[model samples]
Target: NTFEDFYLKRELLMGIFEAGFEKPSPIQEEAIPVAITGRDILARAKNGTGKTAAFVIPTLEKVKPKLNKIQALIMVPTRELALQTSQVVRTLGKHCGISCMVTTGGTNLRDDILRLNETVHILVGTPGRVLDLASRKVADLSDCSLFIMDEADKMLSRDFKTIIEQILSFLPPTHQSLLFSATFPLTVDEFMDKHLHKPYEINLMEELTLKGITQYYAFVEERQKLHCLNTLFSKLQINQAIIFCNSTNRVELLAKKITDLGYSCYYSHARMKQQERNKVFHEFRQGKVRTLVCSDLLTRGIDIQAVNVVINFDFPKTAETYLHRIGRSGRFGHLGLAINLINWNDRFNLYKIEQELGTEIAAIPATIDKSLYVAE
Candidate 1:
């Protein structure tokens, strides 16, 4: 179904057009109507599936223009996701006169308090900081009727599980909830039992990698990994690529190595200062950075349209992480390439991932070729 079929508010329709959404994605097609009806939603969708707008649009529709109370709360796992989601809200809510604010860690709490003093209709934030405000009586969510948890699986983990419960306590007794994620572990079922009641479930989770993305594995010695990357850079015609490392130390080390090779590379990790992280993120998003190296921090919810290739410098430990790492590419149903640099030890992990995902990882060619990997 198209955006037109929703018969949204005039201002919202304008926002959708201004945001350049011509048609609904499969998740949007299945989730929007139920969402607009004020039913709780539990949607399990892969990365880059337009799940953000599926909830953002309905949240916007439910917003009362110029309302002084915070009517909606969006919780994300990372500061980056919070900021990005807030930007989506602002972009789609621009024409609707809806005010939105983002409160995340690494930002001034006083600034967030000041911003909350104003009439904000929507609040997007990470779990910890959002809970901090609620605890301090700064962010009053008593009237907040809509609650959304992006990356729901992560939010239900050991780190955020208690905080999320605290957040739920602050919200009004009666409210609509939306939980979205690519993978939901068994623990999430416990979360669903405690929270979401008779929600509309839209589960489109694929067992394997997205079809638009092609996967390849390059076997290399630990010492030759950098050389393999350099060779690929020389061979593959890349629009933009993200190289994932397992550790922050490795990410920094690899970024330096890549730059020393006379190639411009940007890197980000959770350990970096927020300002620096934002800088790298914005530069990458603006197409200023051709290659970005990072940890699993960039795995979920961050969308870069120009990213055509994803390099797994360090093999992910699980099939879920593998899916998300490669999912960064091939966004919006576009063709993409995912290359895995596997050492001997990583071979077993890679095979495990392939078996779990039900997809075969083809071996890279002996002779590097650009045409073979470039996205269409």
Candidate 2:
């Protein structure tokens, strides 16, 4: 019904058209009606299937600007997503006179509290910050009816499960709920089994993967990791790249080394202050930092169109993690490249990842090798 009546709503349609979205994506067409009908949705679509707009549009349709309080709540996994989703909601709801606010953990809590005290139509945040506000009685969800958990799988990971559970207990038991994710790892099942009630399950590409990515693996000695990285960088000469390391220390070191090698680069990790990290992302996105070295912390929410290459300097923990790392590139129909540098000890982890992903990544050409080991 919404699709049929879509064009009739002149103001809303004009806003959508202004944003250059003439047609709905697959996830949007399917999930929009269900969410509009006030049904609990457990939708599993691919990462770039336009899931953010799918949920934001419906929530915007349902938001009541006159309620004078937070009527919609969105819980996202990362600070970048929180900011990005909040922007989307604001942009779409602007013509409708809606006030949207974002609350994430990385920034100043006092500033967030100040914003939350104002009349907000929709609230986008991480679970911890939302729970923190709710527990302190600085915010209330009594009038909120719509709830969305984007990246539900990521939230249900070992670290966030307990926090999500606690946050769930605070919401009104009967409110409409929507859960969307690119993948549903086994750990996510516990939350779904207990929370969702007769929800429509849409698994778009729950079993498929994007083929636009070309994955390559290189086995090198542990000591020569940086040398191998340098060689790879020179070979690709990629204009934009996101180099993923396993730890903050490594991220810092790798970024420094790359910069010392005369590359414009930046680094990000959890240990860095939020403002500093934000600066790095800003610089990286603006092309001031052509190469970004980071830990797994940079995997999500750093969406930049210029990123044509992703390098895993420290192999991920699992195959699913590998997929997520690479999925950052080749987004929205553009082809991209992903390279993994593995030493003898990392071979086992790489093999396990391959087994779990159910596809074998190609090895770099031995004949074209430019490893740091060649004696000139």
Candidate 3:
């Protein structure tokens, strides 16, 4: 189904087109109709498949500019994810005359206080920041209509679920909750039983990986990982690439090394100052920088359409992290490539990840095909 076929306002449609989205994605096609009908949704889609717009399209549908009170709330696990999700909400709903804002830790709480006074219709945030705002009554969500949680699996974990439950208390007694995640954790059934009312489940996990992404691995010694990366840079036709490392110290080290290799590179991680991180994220997406070295900070559904390559200088421990890291590329079914440099110790993680995702990662060949990740 086309996006125009969905029950969207002309204003929202205009924003969508201006955002450069033309058609409905698989998740958008399935969940948009169900969500607009005011039903509770628990949807599971594969990584980088337009899940944000799937819910955001309908989220924009329910808000009324006349009512200044908070109408909708979207919560995510990290400040980085908060930034990305909040941006998507604004991008799609800009023309709808709805006020959307992102509030997360590490910026300023007093500033958040000021923004709420000015009026914010939709709140996208991390669990802790959202809890503080809702608890302080700064957000005033007593009559809030829609409650959405991206990366809901992590949000509902032992660490975040308690805070999330408090946020739920701030909402109206009767309202719809939409829980979305790339990976489905059945452990949520207990939480949903108490909070949600007969949720409309939308699981699409059968489709594990995107066909547009080609995965390959190179077994290199840990010390020689940088050598392998340089070789990739010399050969692959990269629009923009995000190379993932394991820790904060290593991300910067690798980023500095890339610059030493004489390529303009930017880096981001949790340890960086908020403004610095935001600047790197904005500049990298704007194509001001062609290479970005970062930790798991940029993972979990940060869709940069121009990113055609994802390299794991340090492969992640879990399969979910691996998928989300590669998910940064191959966005909207476009051509992308994922290459991981695995050392001897990483071999076990490699086998486990391959087993979990139900596919084998092939060895990198001498020549990668141009059409695979490059578009002219």
Candidate 4:
């Protein structure tokens, strides 16, 4: 349905129109109304299904216009996502005169302090930075009416367990919380048991996979992976692609090697400077980079509309990760391809993924022909 049917605030409606969002996506359609009703939500929607807007729009509608103290706190896992989510908030809340601030770890803390001194209606940041500020009383969460945990599954990992608990401890007891993720593991279920209270649960995660995606595996030795990737690049007419690596070291190594071989490639990992990451993220979104070599950092909720291909340089460790990695392509019902480079050690992992996903991942032929896969 059209966003207009929601009968949102005039200013918010204007902002949505200005952002060129004509209609609500499936997740947005299901989650936004429930969120506006002031109920807690545990939403599981696929990657790149406008999930960002689902939460951002409801948040914009919930916050009071021009309220000085922070009313909504959005905690994300990565600095890049913090920046992107803040951008969405600002874009959607522009006409509403809502002020939003982003403070992540990689950026300057002094600048964050200065921004916090201003009137911020919504605070978007990573958990560490937010917890630090909250501990220092720089970001006051006592009055925060809405607490959002984006990528809830990842947030429940051991890396964020303590910090998330501490942050929850700081929030006012009366606040409403929403958890959104693409995959909900057992750990996430445990997390929800502690945090969510009779929340509205929406499940659309499974529907996103197995749609218009051609999955293939290229069996090769570990040493021959680069050559196999080269062959794929030479053969396939890729509009834009993301090559997933298991580690930052391999991401940097593969990115440089691909560039040295005269291919247009860029790399992003957790260790890169925030500015460099932002530059690469924007360039890739604009289709300036043909290939992006990255770790699981790009697997979560980062959306690039033109990503027509995904190559798993290192097979993901879990089926959830595999789903997210491949979900980068085949967005919004578009035809896409996911190619996994497998060695001897990965065949078993590949088989597990095949069984878990309930789909066969066929091996690529000795002679490659991209035309067979590309749609007419």
Candidate 5:
């Protein structure tokens, strides 16, 4: 299937074309058709491959707009993703008369309850909040015909399996189920075995590693790594680079140091409020901030372009995580760069990650301006 093949209503297609979607992405071209046919699908695509629209379009087109009831339920792991998905749905369905709403934690719960009381076509939300609303009977999933689990792996990792099982108990048995993820391992397969009926799987492009980027590694002491990062930023005059920290604590610490150095920056982690995270991402996307220090939470399903550099302030635990982190930059065939800060303690995990990736990151030299020490 192609962009033309989506068969999005002529008006919806007009907006898509105006938005510069001349050609459908690999996943978009493949998953769109299967989803439109109302088939259970398991998709393995990269984070920014436009999977939301691939499934959202089909989900929207399948609904009865005048029914004024929830027809599609999209469960996401984080609030940021819920908002992102909901907005994309509303954007494509604007001219089609389809309405979508997002329900998540850390916002006004009463507001969500009010929206639920009104007419809605699609409900995008996190599992916990959705369950809360379900208990209150404010969110109606009885009539929902489609259930989409975006970032399924993350949801599972977050230990929402019990909540999901409870939610599934309330859903109609005949509904279509779609799960999209960057990588699906044995656990994901176990999920499909239990729910889907011989579901078709679409794995787009075996090249999960962003091919356009040159990934580098700089081995420095724990304290000198930040200095090395500062040197890299100063020397390259990086305007819109994302610094990936392994944890939220590190993200906050680094973001504070960067801000004190006269650089505009923002930090994102799972613990922050949803509204606050949205504002930070909005500013970062708009170029108001030249640097963004974030946790692994920013790795998946974010489609912001114009990012040329990715700095790994700490090593990721897995090769897949590394691929997704660096892949955030150098999107859509653009030349991008990924730099990793490596300390002696991370040698084992770094080597393991490099081995599994089947590529070695060339060593980078430290500049004179960088200090390689952090006081213990």
Candidate 6:
């Protein structure tokens, strides 16, 4: 977390701490060093984490402030993100005598050209305006070596591909490219293998662990499980629910059951196609599905927020697995409920899991109060 370890210049360090960057995020720690060494980067990190600085600090150090050319290129997917990313560049490079201007559309094209005509040392932009300026031959990116594109999730599209291909044409070919995102397509590696030269991969995704959950168990027979689950649903105020199953087939079975029981439900497992799995998650996060049944597919990648109730129809075997199931619902300080349906076969596992997790699995009271999960 220390900024000193990166050996950033003294002037940049002042602006860093002064700019409220007293300690670096994990992605920054992984990125700053190799970035200064002139390597391409494929980094995956959480959205709210400090990613803007992860790539910005290195380029700020790499750029020759006295050089009149735009020494580096920074592209964020949207116009507003262009402004935000450039603001970070401005803040971190404040004392280094570097000049950075955000170039984006929805502004006067002539005004942007006027600004680009000046000796802007580093340029942050939306790809369209940058391509427009570059095609005009007004923006000289002839020797710009540092190539960074943030939020790579939104950074890919047909027009984006064409625009970026046009933009990459400007980089004195074989320039280092830095790409960052929370989720990566399976083909991203395919793209990077051909595009980025000897790219280093940095994954700073945080571990899945939950805190402040009302973890309680309801002992039921295997045949009595559905009745118990339905009763809990009837008793609880559910914003959204995730019910876990041990078997992949059981996921489909129970998902159908929940839906037939007059509630919308979705399910996922390892056997499903990756594209289908992500689509289910996309809709679930958007409030399209209220109940989800799945194998241990609870993921940090799907950053779901509308869930406050998690059900385990079949209790998990290991403490580590149980913890992750509980984690998916009660995340980032949300007081979600983790209800485990314990059977005779799972009795030992229930104690084994609780012992290792270092918490009591309370016997659920007959009535769960609305204030526990309904308030969000």
| TM-score against truth, every candidate | 0.59, 0.57, 0.59, 0.59, 0.58, 0.59
Q: For model 5, what is the alpha-carbon lDDT of residue 25?
A: 78
Q: Global lDDT for candidate 5?
A: 0.75
What are the runs in model 2 whose C-alpha is more than 4 Å off? 1-10, 206-376
Task: Give the lowest summed-lDDT range of ten residues in model 5.
Answer: 367-376
The lDDT of model 1 is 0.81
Candidate lDDT scores, in order, read: 0.81, 0.75, 0.82, 0.80, 0.75, 0.80
Backbone collisions counted per model = 0, 0, 0, 0, 4, 0
Residue pairs in collision within model 2: none
TM-score of 1: 0.59
| lDDT of each residue in 40-94, candidate 5, tens digit only | 9988765552667778777867888888889999998878778888888878777
Q: How well does candidate 3 match the true structure, expressed as C-alpha RMSD?
A: 17.5
Candidate 1 residues 205-226, lDDT tens each? 6433354567889889889999
What clash pairs does model 6 have? none
Q: Write the residue-wise lDDT of candidate 2 on 219-307 in tens digits.
A: 87868888988887777747688999888888888888888888778788889788888888887888986788887763366457577
Give the poorly placed runs of model 1, Cα more than 4 Å off.
186-188, 208-339, 342-376
For candidate 1, the 10 contiguous residues with the lowest summed lDDT are 326-335
User: Residue 186's C-alpha lDDT in candidate 2?
Assistant: 35
Better of 3 and 6 by lDDT: 3
Local error of candidate 3 at residue 84 (angstroms): 1.0
Query: How high a TM-score does candidate 2 get?
Result: 0.57
lDDT of 1 at 268: 93
Least accurate 10 contiguous residues by lDDT in model 2? 367-376
